[PDB]
Paper text:
The T5 family of viruses are tailed bacteriophages characterized by a long non-contractile tail. The bacteriophage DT57C is closely related to the paradigmal T5 phage, though it recognizes a different receptor (BtuB) and features highly divergent lateral tail fibers (LTF). We present a composite map determined by electron cryo-microscopy (cryo-EM) at resolutions ranging between 2.9 Å to 4.9 Å of the entire T5-like phage particle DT57C, and atomic models comprising its core structural proteins. Our results provide a complete atomic structure of a T5-like phage, provide insights into the process of DNA ejection as well as a structural basis for the design of engineered phages and future mechanistic studies.
The first layer directly interacts with the last TTP ring and is composed of an inner trimeric ring of TTMP surrounded by a dodecameric ring of LtfC. The inner trimeric TTMP ring is surrounded by an outer ring composed of 12 LtfC monomers. LtfC adopts a compact, single-domain structure composed mostly of β-sheets, with each TTMP monomer contacted by four copies of LtfC. A cavity remains between the TTMP and the part of the LtfC ring distal to the tail tube, into which LtfA is inserted. The N-terminal portions of LtfA form a lasso-like structure filling the groove between the LtfC and TTMP rings, such that each LtfA copy extends in opposite direction as observed from the outer end of the helical bundle. The capsid-distal LtfA contacts the capsid-proximal LtfA from an adjacent LtfA trimer, enabling the formation of a closed ring. The β-strands of all LtfA copies interact with the LtfC ring by augmenting their β-sheets of the latter to eight- or nine-stranded sheets by donating one or two strands from LtfA. The loops of the two long β-hairpins of TTMP extend tailward and contact the next ring, composed of six copies of Dit. Finally, a trimer of TTHP closes the tail tip complex. The cavity enclosed by the TTHP also contained additional density for a small α-helical coiled coil region, which was assigned as the C-terminal part of the TMP based on its location within the lumen of the tail tube tip, the fact that this region is predicted α-helical, and a close fit to the AlphaFold model.
Author numbering:
A (entry chain Q), C (entry chain R), D (entry chain S): 2 to 140
B (entry chain T): 4 to 140
E (entry chain L): 76 to 297
F (entry chain L): 2 to 297
G (entry chain f): 8 to 54
H (entry chain d): 6 to 49
I (entry chain H), J (entry chain I): 1 to 204
Amino acid sequence: STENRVIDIVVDEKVPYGLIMQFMDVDDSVYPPSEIPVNLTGYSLRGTIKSSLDENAETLASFTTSIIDAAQGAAAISLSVADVTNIGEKASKERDKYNPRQRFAGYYDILMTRDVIGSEVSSFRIMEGKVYISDGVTQ
Amino acid sequence: ENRVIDIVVDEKVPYGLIMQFMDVDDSVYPPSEIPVNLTGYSLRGTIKSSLDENAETLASFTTSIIDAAQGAAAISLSVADVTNIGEKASKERDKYNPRQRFAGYYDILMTRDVIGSEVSSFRIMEGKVYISDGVTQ
Amino acid sequence: STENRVIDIVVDEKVPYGLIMQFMDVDDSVYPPSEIPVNLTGYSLRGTIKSSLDENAETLASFTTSIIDAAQGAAAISLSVADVTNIGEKASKERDKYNPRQRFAGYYDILMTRDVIGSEVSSFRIMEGKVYISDGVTQ
Amino acid sequence: STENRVIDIVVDEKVPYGLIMQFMDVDDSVYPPSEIPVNLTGYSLRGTIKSSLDENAETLASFTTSIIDAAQGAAAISLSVADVTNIGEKASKERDKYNPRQRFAGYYDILMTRDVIGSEVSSFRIMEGKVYISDGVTQ
Amino acid sequence: ANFFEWLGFDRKGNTFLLPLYSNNIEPIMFNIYIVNKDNNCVYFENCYVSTVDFSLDKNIPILNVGIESGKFSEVSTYREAASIIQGEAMSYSPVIVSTNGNILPGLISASLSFQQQCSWREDKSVFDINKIYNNKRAYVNEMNASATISLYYLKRFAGDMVYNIEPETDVPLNIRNNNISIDFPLARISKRLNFSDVYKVEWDIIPTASSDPVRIDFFGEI
Amino acid sequence: YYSLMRESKVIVEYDGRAFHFDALSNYDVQTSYEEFKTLRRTIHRRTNYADSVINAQTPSSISLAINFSNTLTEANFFEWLGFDRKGNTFLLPLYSNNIEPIMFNIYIVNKDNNCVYFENCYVSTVDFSLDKNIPILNVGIESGKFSEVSTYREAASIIQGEAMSYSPVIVSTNGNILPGLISASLSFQQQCSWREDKSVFDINKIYNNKRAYVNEMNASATISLYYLKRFAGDMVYNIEPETDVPLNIRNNNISIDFPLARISKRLNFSDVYKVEWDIIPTASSDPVRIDFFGEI
Amino acid sequence: IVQQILNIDDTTTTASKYPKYTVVLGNSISSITAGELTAAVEASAGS
Amino acid sequence: KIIVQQILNIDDTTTTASKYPKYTVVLGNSISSITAGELTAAVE
Amino acid sequence: MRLPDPYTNPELSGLGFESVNLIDNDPVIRDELPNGKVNEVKVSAQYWGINISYPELFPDEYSVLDAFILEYKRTGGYIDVILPQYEAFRVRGNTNLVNIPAGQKGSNITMDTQGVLTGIPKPGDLFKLSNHPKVYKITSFNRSGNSWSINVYPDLFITTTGAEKPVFNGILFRTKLMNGDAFGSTLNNNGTYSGISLNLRESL
Amino acid sequence: MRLPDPYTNPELSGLGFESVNLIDNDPVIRDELPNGKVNEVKVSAQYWGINISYPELFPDEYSVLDAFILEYKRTGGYIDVILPQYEAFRVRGNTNLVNIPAGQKGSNITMDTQGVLTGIPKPGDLFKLSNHPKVYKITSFNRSGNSWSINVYPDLFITTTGAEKPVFNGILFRTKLMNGDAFGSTLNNNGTYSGISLNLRESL
C-alpha cells in the first residue's frame, strides 16, 4: 500500500498532549497478509518542533518519549502543558477556513533509532508532518 | 466519531443531556463494550461568545456524575441561564426559517482526579450552540 | 528495451545515507530463475555529485564506498551526515506548494572499474541521475 | 536501403567505449530461419568519425578495430579515453531538449573489406549513423 | 439530508452512515404532492428513492435525485407545509481531496453516486380483471456507494512509485468542501490514463469488504 | 512538471532499430485494468460492501494519423502489416506462411523522463483516402502490455522527412481514364485474435496477453463518381456489376493496382446523381501492387 | 515487509480514544544495513 | 548478412554477442533477507 | 458436530447460505377410486429435506468446509444445523422451569408455563423436545392464562415421559449427507469455487 | 515424469490449466429405512479424480504435449501431477529424521517430531507417506510438545512398518489416463489445435 510517512497533528491549548503508537510487521507472501507485533526492544525515539524548515528556525518544543510495552510494540510521546502554552503563544493568528479553531504552528519530526546489534546504531525518519493548535474557550 | 457535536437549546425551557462512557474491544466479535467506572472523574465547561480568548462568557453548565458503575454523567442549564443567552445571542433571524439563532461556542473538559496525585485532562466535546426562540411561557 | 540507467535519489537531511547494489548473472532456464552472484573481487566504485553539468561546476561530495561481499556480489555506497549537511546549505531554495520539503541538489554519476586492467576496456558508467534533499528538523 | 544499416551510438565522457559484433548468415527458406556464423577470416574492418559529411570536416577519432575468434564471426571495435574526451571537447554545445545530458557530435561510417581476392577483393559499408555524447560528472 | 435518511442511511444527528448489512427488505415508502394555482394539483402516492448523485466540478454543486413512484392521480388539494422550508443556498467553496492528511495535487473533479436498486413485485392477478392495476410493493435488491476523481498526471521525481499507475488498495480517502465531508476508511482504486493534450488520470473508487462505515457530514455556514 | 501532447514524441522499435515518426499529425490512446467483483448477498448477512480484485491489463487500442513523408519511412508500416517487399514495391502474397503477426514495440516520450512503453503490439489496420485533401494515413494498432518508464532508446537518422507536395488523383482501366471522379478511399487489414492464456497458475499475479494469431487479411476500396453516360443507349457505363476489370489508381507519388477486380455499384439520386463503386479482388487475381515515388 | 504503525490519541495513561491513523513505512525496521559488516566482524571474533 | 552487436562490458571479458541482456544489477536501501533477530542470535 | 457458519466463525463472511430449500417429505400410499374418491394413509416417518447453495468461496474458507466434511465422513457422526430465519427470537425465559405432563400423544401438546415465559410463538415457528432429535412446526397456539396448548406437525414420534423440556430457540436439525460419494470442486480461473451446494436429509 | 507446465516450461504458458476439477469418489451402498434411519456400508477404495481443460494450443507446445503422452503410452508408466493451490511450504525441517512407530493403522497417525520440525500443518493440507504413492488430506491436528497427531482422510491403505516418513511438501499425484483410449486433436485452419481435455484417476 501507499508508503505514507506523513501525518499532521492537532494539539489543543491549555491541555497536555499525548500520542500512543503500535508497531506491526505485515507480510503479504500469504493471504490474508499476516500482522505481527514488533518486539520494540532496544529502539529509541526523538523528535522536535520548530516554526519553519529553515536552518535557523527556533525550536518551540521537544517530545517526552518512552517505550510502553516492548513485547507489544507500544510506545508513546507527549508534551507538557507549558510546552502547549509556548506553542499557542508562538503560533499564527491566521485561522483556517475549514475549521476556524485551528491555527498553524510549525513542523515536526519523530526520528527513531535502533542500537540493537553489535553495539552500533542507525536512525531513520519514520514520521513527519505539520502541527496545529486548536483554540479552546474553556480555561 | 469526532469531538464535534452541535447543540440546540430551547428558549425558556430547562435543558439537560446525558451520556455514559464505556470501554470497547472488538477482539470479541460482535464488538464487546463495558461501562467505564467514573469514580473520581469530574467535568467542567462554559459557553462563550467567540473562540477569541478575549470573548465574553455567556453561561456555565451544571454537571454531575449520576452513576459511576453505569459510567453515566449529565449536564444541564436552568431557564435563567438560557434566558441570559437569549438576551445576548445574535439577531440574524433567518428570512425563511427564523427560529434558529446562533449564540456561540462551547467546550467541555473532564479532569481524571485520582489517587497517586496525578491529574490529566482531555476534552470530550466541542461545537457550536444555537438557541430556538420561545414564543410561550 | 533500454538499460534503465537513469535513476534519481532523495537524501533525508541530518541523517546518514546508504545504498546497496548486487550484480547477478541470470539464466531464464526455469520458472524460478537461475540467478547467480557475480564475483566482485578486485573491482572498485567511484562517484561524485556536482551542482551542474559543466567543466568547472561546484563539487558537493564524494561517495564513501566498499564491497560487503565478493561472492554475494554486493557493493555499497554511502554518505555521512557531514556530507549531506554540506548539501543542505547549497541546494536551491525553491519549495513546492504541495511538497515543501523537497529541494533539488545536483547531478550524480556512478562509475565502476577493475582494479587490475583488462586494458581493452577498463571501466563503465553504471548509473546516473539527480539528487534531491528532503529538509528535516531534528538532530 | 539505408533504412537498416543505421545505428545512432551514444558515447559517454571520461570513459572508453567498446562494441562486439557477431556476423550471421541466414536464410528464412525454413521457419525458423537457417543461421550460421560467417567465417570472418581474411576480412578487415575500418571506420572513422567526422564532425560533418563535408569533405573538409575534421577527423575526430579513428576506431581501434580487431577480429577475434574469426571462425565464430566475432569482431570488436573501441575508442580510447583520449578519443572520448577529445570528441567530448569538440562536439556541439546545444543540449538536447529531451535529455540535457547529451549533445550531438557528428557522423560515422564502418566499412569492411576482403584482404584476399576470394571471389572479390572488394569493400562494402556495414554500419552507419551519427554519434551523440552523454556528458558526465565523475572523473 | 432527509433524502439520505429516506434512502436508508442510518442517522446520528447530522452524521450519516451506511450500515454494513441492513435489516430492511422494503425500501422506505413516501408520498409526494405537486401543487399549482387553481387547485390544479397532482398526487403521487407510493414512491421510493432510487438514486442520489452529485459532483463538485467547479460549479455550484447541484444534487440530482432519481425517484420512482407506483401510482398517481390528479387531486384538488394538498397538505400545507410552511415551517419545514428549505432555506437559503450555501456560499461556494473549493473542493479538497486528501489521504491521511496528505493533500492531493492537481485536482480536476470529483463525482459521487449512491443508489438503492429495487424491484417492484408484480402482483397482477385474475382477480384484477376489469380493474385498473397498480404496483404496490417493491423489494430492495442492492445498495451502492461509488465515486470518480479526475486529475492531471503528475510525478514527484522520475523514479517515484507513490503516484504510479498501478492500483493501490486499502487507501483511506477523504473528500470535502467547506460544508460537506465524505470519508472512505478503506478503499480500492482503479486507474485509467488518457493522453489528452494534458495527460489526465481518472481514479475509480470503491470501498473494500472489510472497510468501516463510510461517513458523511454536513456543516452550516454562519 | 506537467506534460503536453504538443511536445510529445513517438518512437517505434523493431529488429533492434528505432524509427522516429517525426511528422505525426495526431494520436489517441487509453489504458485500463480489468477487475473481478462480487457482492455475496447472504441471508445471514445481506452484505452491502463488494469484494473485488484487479487481475489484468486491458489490451490497449492505439490510433495514429500520419502525413505522407518524403523518404517514405512509413512504408515500413506495410512491411509490418505483412506485405512482402521488393525495394519500394509491396505485394500481397496470395497465401501466407505467417501464423503470428509481426510483433513490435513502442515508446511514447516526453520531457522530464516522463515516458511510457508499450511492449507487444501488432498492426490491425491501415486506411486512407485521396479525397481532395492532403492525404492523411490512419493506422489502427493494438498492444497487449504497457508500463511507465524513465527512459527510451535514442533514434536520430531514421527520421520521417518533409511532407510531399499535393497532387490530384487519377483512376484508370487499361489506360482509359474515368470521367467525373469525386473520391477514392482505401483500407487494408490484418484481423487477429489474442490467445487467452490466463491460468490458475496466474492467481495473485497480474496477467497480460502475450500472443495472437492472424485470422484474416483484407484489401478493399470505394470510389465515388458523378453519374455519366456517353450516349443514351450505351452499355459500358451502366449500373450492372462488371467483373474481371483491371483497375489502377494513382497520385503523382503513389500507385495502386488491382490486376482483376469485381465491382458492385450503388446509385444515389442526390441533387446530382452519384455512383459508388465497391471494389474487391477476384479469387484468381494476381498480386495487387503498390508503389511509392519520391518527389524531387 | 512493509511495516504498519497505528497511532492514536492518549487520554489517560494506558487509555486511548478511537480516532486513529495509520503509517505505512515502506521498509521493515528489521531490515539491516552496513551493520552486516560489524556483525560479521564480531561473530568472527567470537569464532 | 545479419550483424548483431552489444556493448563490451568490463566484467564479461569477451564472448559472442547475444540477443538478450545478460547481467542484472539490483538496488536497494536495505536488506530484507536478514532479520535483526537472526543477526543478533548469530552474534550472541 | 455443528456446521460452521457466520455465527461460529463470523470472520468467514462468505460462509453463509445464498439460498435454502426446506422440503417436507411425507410418504403415503395414495389410491384413486373410480367414484372419484382420493384415499391417503400416513405410513413411515415424515422427514425434512434441506437443499443449500453457497455463494462463491475463497480457498481458505473452502478448505475449512472441506476439512469439516471429511471429518464428518471419517467419524460417521451427524451434521447439526440451525436455520437463521427461524432463529429470530420471540419467546424467552428459563425453559427448564416449564413442566410437561407425561402421556401426551397426538398432535396436541399442553404445558404449564407457571407464568415464566414471555411472548408467544407464531404459527410457522419451530419447536423441539429436549430429549429427542425430531423437530416440529407450530400450526397453531392457544393460551389460557399460563397454560399453553400447541398443535404441531408432524404428530409426535414419542409419548411424553413427563421429563421433557421445550426448546424454542437454537433448534438444531440432525442430518446426513446424500452427495458424499461423488463430491467435487472446480477451481475457477479467477480463483474461486462455484456451485458448492448440499442436499441434506434428516435422519432419526 | 511430470505433466509439463509453466513451472517446468514457462515459455509454453498455454500449458497452464485453464481450470481444474478435483473429485472425491467414495463408492458406498446406502439405503433409507421407513423409520427414517439412514444406513450405509463401505467397500472398495476411495480415489481422487481430476479433470483438466486447455485453451487453444499452438503447434510447438502441442507437439511437446504429444511427445509426452505418447511416451507414456509406449512405456505404460504413470503420470505425475502437481496441484498448485496446495503449494505452500508452511512445514519444513529434517523430515527424514522423524520417527513414526510401526503398527499404526486406521485413520490416526502419531509422530515423534523430536522437536525438529518448524511450523504446523493446517486442515486441508495434503499429506503423504514416503514409501507409498497415496495422497491423504488432513482433517485435524494436535500437539503435545514434540509429539504430534493427525487424523487423516481417507483411512490408511497400509500398516506402518516403522520405516515410513511423512512428506508435507512437493506431493505429486500418480495417475493414469482413463480418457486415453480415444484420444485425438482437432486441427483448425487457424493452424491451432483445439478441444483437448484430460480425465485422470489416481492409481497406485
